[PDB]
Every structure is written in C-alpha cells, then in structure tokens.
Amino acid sequence: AMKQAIGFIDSGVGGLTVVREVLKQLPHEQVYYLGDTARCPYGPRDKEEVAKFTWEMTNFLVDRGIKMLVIACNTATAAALYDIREKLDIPVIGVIQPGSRAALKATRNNKIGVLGTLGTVESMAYPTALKGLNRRVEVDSLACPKFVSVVESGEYKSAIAKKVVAESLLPLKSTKIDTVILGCTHYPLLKPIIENFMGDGVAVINSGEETASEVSALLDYHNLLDATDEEIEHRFFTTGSTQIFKDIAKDWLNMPDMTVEHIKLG
Amino acid sequence: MKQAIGFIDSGVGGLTVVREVLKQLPHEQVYYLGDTARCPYGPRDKEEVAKFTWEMTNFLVDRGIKMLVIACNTATAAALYDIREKLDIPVIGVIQPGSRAALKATRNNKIGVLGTLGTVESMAYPTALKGLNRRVEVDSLACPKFVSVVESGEYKSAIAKKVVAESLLPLKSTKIDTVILGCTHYPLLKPIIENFMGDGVAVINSGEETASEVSALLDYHNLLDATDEEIEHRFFTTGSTQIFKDIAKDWLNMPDMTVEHIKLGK
Ligand SMILES: [Cl-]
Ligand SMILES: [Cl-]
Ligand SMILES: [Cl-]
C-alpha cells in the first residue's frame, strides 16, 4: 500500500484526543495508534524509564511503518521528544508546545493554569515552554493524580468523575487564572465536567486541535501529505485489554468499526 | 546572536501577519520588506514576480534572517518551492495556513474564499484546501474594492459597510460557514465582514495561523529566542517611507518605528 500512517503513542487512551483532531483536519491520513495501557500510569515514573517506554513504543510503530510520529503524551514529550526527534529522520512532535501556543492565544489577562500528572508538573516543561514564548505570562501548575485512572476506567462521564474534578480543581478558584491547559492528553475526556466546574470565565484548553494543525503543517511542509484514494485502514494497538479500549475509543471517536489489537512491549 | 524573522510583501498588507507574530512571538525581531514601488503584483507576469520575490529574499538574507514568511499570495504561488530549496532556512506563505485554519473552523465543509482578482483566478486556495480535504466545497469571490478601502483608511467608517454588503451579497445565498480572508489587507475589514455574515460564519484572518506555524517551525529547530531585551525591528520599503509608516504605526501600535527606503532591481 502507498498510504503511510502517522504514528501516535501514549500511556493509554489520552492520545485519542489528538487523533480526533487529526481525523477532522487531515481526513485522508491513516492513523497508527499505540496506547501502553498495561504500564499506565506513566505519571509517577522517573524520566529515564518513561523515555525507555517511549522508545519501545516508537520502535514498535517505526517497524509497522510510519511517515511521522506524534508523542501524544505529555510526560513522554518531556522525557524523550528531543532524543527521538534527533535520532529519527521522520518528523516528530509532542503535545506541550502546541498547548502552550493555544493557551497563550486564549488568555486575556496572562494568568495561565496547567493541569497535569506528577511527572509533567515536576518536569517544569509547561512553565519553561510558556515563558520561552512570552516571559511575562504567569504560570501555575496543579497535579491531578486521580484523573488518569478515572478516564482509563471509563468513569469520566459519571458522578464520581464530577466529584474528583471538584475536589482537585477547587484551588484554582482562589486565583485569577483565566485559562487552564489540559496538560495531560487524557484530561479532555473530563472537559465538560471541568468547564461546568470552572464556569464561563475560564477557557479550558484541549491541546489536540493545535497539535493536529502542526501535524498538517509539517506534512504539507515536507510534501508528505497523502495524495491517494486508497482505503484508509486505521490501526489501534494496546498493551491492555482491547474491549475496554474499544469502549472508550468508540465513545470519543465517531468510529463503530474500529480495529483494536493487543500487543507486547519489552 | 539574534536573528530576525523575515517578511516579504508587495506592500502594506503583510503587516497584518506581522501583527500576529508580535502577539504570539513577542521575543522575536521582525524584518519586513514591502515592495510598494511595484505593487500591485496581481496582474503581473508569473515569471517576473519570481524575480522580484527573489530580490526581496536576497535583501533580507543579507541582513541575517532565520525564517522567511512570504506574505504576498502572488509571490508564494510563483516562487515558494524554489526559495525553500535554495535557502537553508524555513520559508512559508499564508495560503496553506489560511486553508488549515478554515478546515478547523468549518462544520459543514463549505468554505468561501475572498481575495484579489489575481488570487482567486490562481485557485491557490482551492488547490491548498482540496490537498488537505478533497470533499470540501469552495466558492471563490474577487473583491476588487477592498484593498483601497483598507489602504485609504475607509475601513474605519460607515462607507466601508456599504462596500462590504455590496461585494459579499452573493454569499448570503450559499450555505458557507467559513470565509477565508485571502488577501492580507482584508483583516482590517474583519469586524465589518463578521457583522454582515453573522454568528453562523467563521471569518479567517490567515495571519493568526501563519504566526502559529512560524512559532512551531522555530520551535522544531530550537530557534525560539527566550529573551525580549535586544529587539530591533527593521521595516523596509521601495516606496514612500512616510505613507507606509503612517499605516504601519497604527496597525502595529508602534509610534516610534522607523521605515527605511531601499532600492531593488533595475
Ligand atoms: Cl502525562
Ligand atoms: Cl500522576
Ligand atoms: Cl495578499
């Protein structure tokens, strides 16, 4: 086949928040997705181990054949983007810089909040990236350890999801923050709950749309856009159970006949 | 050492793209070259425009630029690919970004393109749009009077309202939900165009997405400046420095700028 996939890697279902926007903006492009569900959560892992896992996921998709790689996971971007971009010859991007661009576009008062895992918050990748674009922006980050489990368990629409968001995000209401970055790719699955809680004064940013535009931009830049009418065969891979992944994926994506497969990494 | 982002244009229109780069990339210095002595470019030879475009590029490269934006739609159709190949810096135009931005904004995949007679005759927008999404419907409409309404300053007033209603009337009979301002002068008319078309239509200032791609490309190459301290913008024209300054200092909110007159070609 002539169609080459864009690859996406993530600790689980998070990266689907980028995939949705790629399906929208780049409808002719084939998606190969890998969620490392079995070693989720990545949040509390050290930088070295996260990078090692990101490489295992990368090597898996490079072997299947990809023309580009999106590290659709914040802690993986922080841990390993530069090394992976360096060593591969295909385009590689992450999700931190696009979310930073999106947030700085949405803010009115330059007070930005960031929600993330422990690994991401401790990396300081968000404040560094944001102040590297605009050194006068204020950036405060809030770790939300429970969000990933709630999303992976498929409880993200439920009453318990409403409660854990209310508990975790309460501190933000003490500040004047007007923009909140969803700095874990899983969190947009909680976005309706986060928006209701924070109200109309706070723009809640899903980094997926800006990431998908950058994918489009780079493909267009290097003449890598697919120009074929070959039938699109999206492939999804998980290190965990396929049915749970399908149930979440089919809810987030409008895709009833999705092909999901279980694989091994190590 | 601090290097500028280069912009080349036939005139003042491209300053609307510079404006968004000032917002999104406040640490970066800009070098802008407007060839006012030889505009409009639209009804000129396709080959001759490439020569002019090359002359402007060479001028800015001699002055140390780390990125080139070709803000002129005729310039980008006539010599973007050639300029990338020869230079060792990133070069982009405003057409692909506008198209990318329209595909994000559209909900029913029916898009209108506004521009000069020359732009809409070139099909640059439809070409780019259908390269990304082949199912998108595109209607193209020349708006000859808009460039003068803008340069003359009549956009600030009620007289501009009538001109917009007259020119864009055909579009109300379509189901278009997105309109691309496919001339860099047209953003000064955006509020008037939004009021006329109404809440159901997204109006696209292609300068915004262009500025984001500039930010993304600089970041890919680790060429984003962290600091703001030593910024020294340069603005160059082959025509009247005073006429240009008078426009530019309003649009860019930069009362103390200087505009340098230059000589290009024969
Ligand atoms: Cl993460
Ligand atoms: Cl965590
Ligand atoms: Cl133009």
From Swiss-Prot, chain A:
Q: Which reactions fall under this protein's catalytic activity?
A: L-glutamate = D-glutamate
Known EC number(s)?
5.1.1.3
One Gene Ontology term of the molecular function aspect: glutamate racemase activity
Keyword Transmembrane carried by entry: no
Q: Which amino acids does the record list as binding substrate? A: 10-11, 42-43, 74-75, 185-186
Gene3D superfamilies referenced in this protein's UniProt entry, alphabetically: 3.40.50.1860
Q: In which pathway does it act?
A: Cell wall biogenesis; peptidoglycan biosynthesis
Any one Pfam family here would be: Asp_Glu_race
Q: Which UniProt keywords apply?
A: Cell shape, Cell wall biogenesis/degradation, Isomerase, Peptidoglycan synthesis
| Classification via SUPFAM superfamilies | Aspartate/glutamate racemase
GO biological process per UniProt: cell wall organization; peptidoglycan biosynthetic process; regulation of cell shape
Q: What InterPro entries does its record include?
A: Asp/Glu/hydantoin_racemase (IPR015942), Asp/Glu_race (IPR001920), Asp/Glu_racemase_AS_1 (IPR018187), Asp/Glu_racemase_AS_2 (IPR033134), Glu_race (IPR004391)
- Tell me which family the UniProt entry assigns to this protein: Belongs to the aspartate/glutamate racemases family.
Protein function: Provides the (R)-glutamate required for cell wall biosynthesis.
Q: Which NCBIfam families match?
A: glut_race (TIGR00067), PRK00865.1-3 (NF002035)
Q: What is this protein called?
A: Glutamate racemase
